[PDB]
């Protein structure tokens, strides 16, 4: 039968074998990505409704001198292999665990996220305003231990109510730089979302040069784009990076404390 095809991604250290453990128990298979000898493995699990199939993806900050787990991630999540994905959190470290969750709600992914390590988070004295969190990012949050199976239950939940993220206004880019974005998102491959089209922009624009793989003929007007930015603006590339950490950053002072 077809399976929800669902992707575990989060930055390393997040807590994020150990849920697919708790998740998939033995039902899993271990083989390597195509053409790197970088481990695969994906498991089976069964919600109320859903027969899951889980891909532990590797570890990584974002999805932009880099690594294979870095773009073994990106392609994955690129691919539309996945009809959702659970996004890993470290509670204790928010700030730094939230700039690969806006990535994934930028290109508009349907996915939840599993808020987990909370008890180091208790006992580091930080607490979550979960619900907070689920506004700003426009999609579940759900609270984890995954070392003590804690609201497994409770994912599994979310899984079965998997719907279309929240469209709500997350990063705050100036106007040029999304008028840039779109402009070379219009001469992209047609078949790709325009959402990702946007996103796969700003990512040119800031400097990701396998990005460009994706973008098609776009990949030519990047220099006239880049040219016209710098006229209107100091340094366009470290703009973008400003407007990520400012908006985490003020989310993160609302939803931590
Ligand atoms: N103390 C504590 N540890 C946790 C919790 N949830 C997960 N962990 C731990 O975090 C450690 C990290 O291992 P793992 O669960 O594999 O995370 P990972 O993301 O797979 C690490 P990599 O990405 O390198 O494979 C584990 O020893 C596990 O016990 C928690 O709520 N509290
Ligand atoms: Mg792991």
Same mark, same amino acid.
């Given at each position: ?82 009809? #959702? ?8 470290? !928010?700030?730094?665990?939230?700039? $690969?969750? %806006? +990535?994934? &709600? /930028? ?76 402009? #070379? ?8 979302? !325009?959402?990702?089209?946007?996103? $796969?922009? %700003? +990512?040119? &624009? /800031? ?51």
């Amino acid at each position: 039968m077809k399976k929800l095809t669902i992707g575990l991604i989060g930055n390393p250290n997040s807590g994020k074998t150990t849920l697919f453990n708790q998740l998939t128990g033995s039902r899993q298979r271990v083989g390597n990505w195509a053409g790197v000898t970088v481990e695969r493995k994906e498991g089976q699990f069964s919600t109320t409704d859903h027969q899951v199939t889980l891909v532990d993806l590797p570890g990584t900050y974002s999805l932009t001198q880099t690594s294979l787990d870095e773009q073994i991630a990106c392609h994955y999540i690129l691919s539309g292999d996945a009809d #959702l994905l659970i996004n890993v959190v470290d509670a204790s470290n !928010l700030e730094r665990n939230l700039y $690969l969750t %806006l +990535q994934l &709600l /930028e290109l508009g992914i349907p996915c939840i996220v599993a808020l987990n390590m909370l008890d180091i988070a208790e006992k580091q004295n930080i607490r979550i305003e979960i619900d907070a969190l689920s506004a700003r990012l426009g999609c579940p949050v759900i609270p984890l231990v995954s070392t003590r199976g804690r609201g497994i239950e409770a994912l599994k939940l979310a899984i079965d109510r998997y719907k279309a993220n929240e469209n709500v206004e997350l990063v705050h880019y100036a106007q040029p730089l999304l008028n840039e974005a779109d402009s #070379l998102a219009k001469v992209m491959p047609s078949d790709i979302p !325009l959402k990702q089209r946007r996103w $796969l922009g %700003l +990512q040119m &624009l /800031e400097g990701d040069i396998y990005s460009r793989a994706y973008a098609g003929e776009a990949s030519q007007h990047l220099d006239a784009a880049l040219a016209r930015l710098r006229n209107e603006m100091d340094d366009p590339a470290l703009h973008i990076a400003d407007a990520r950490y400012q908006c985490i950053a003020a989310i993160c002072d609302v939803v931590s404390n």
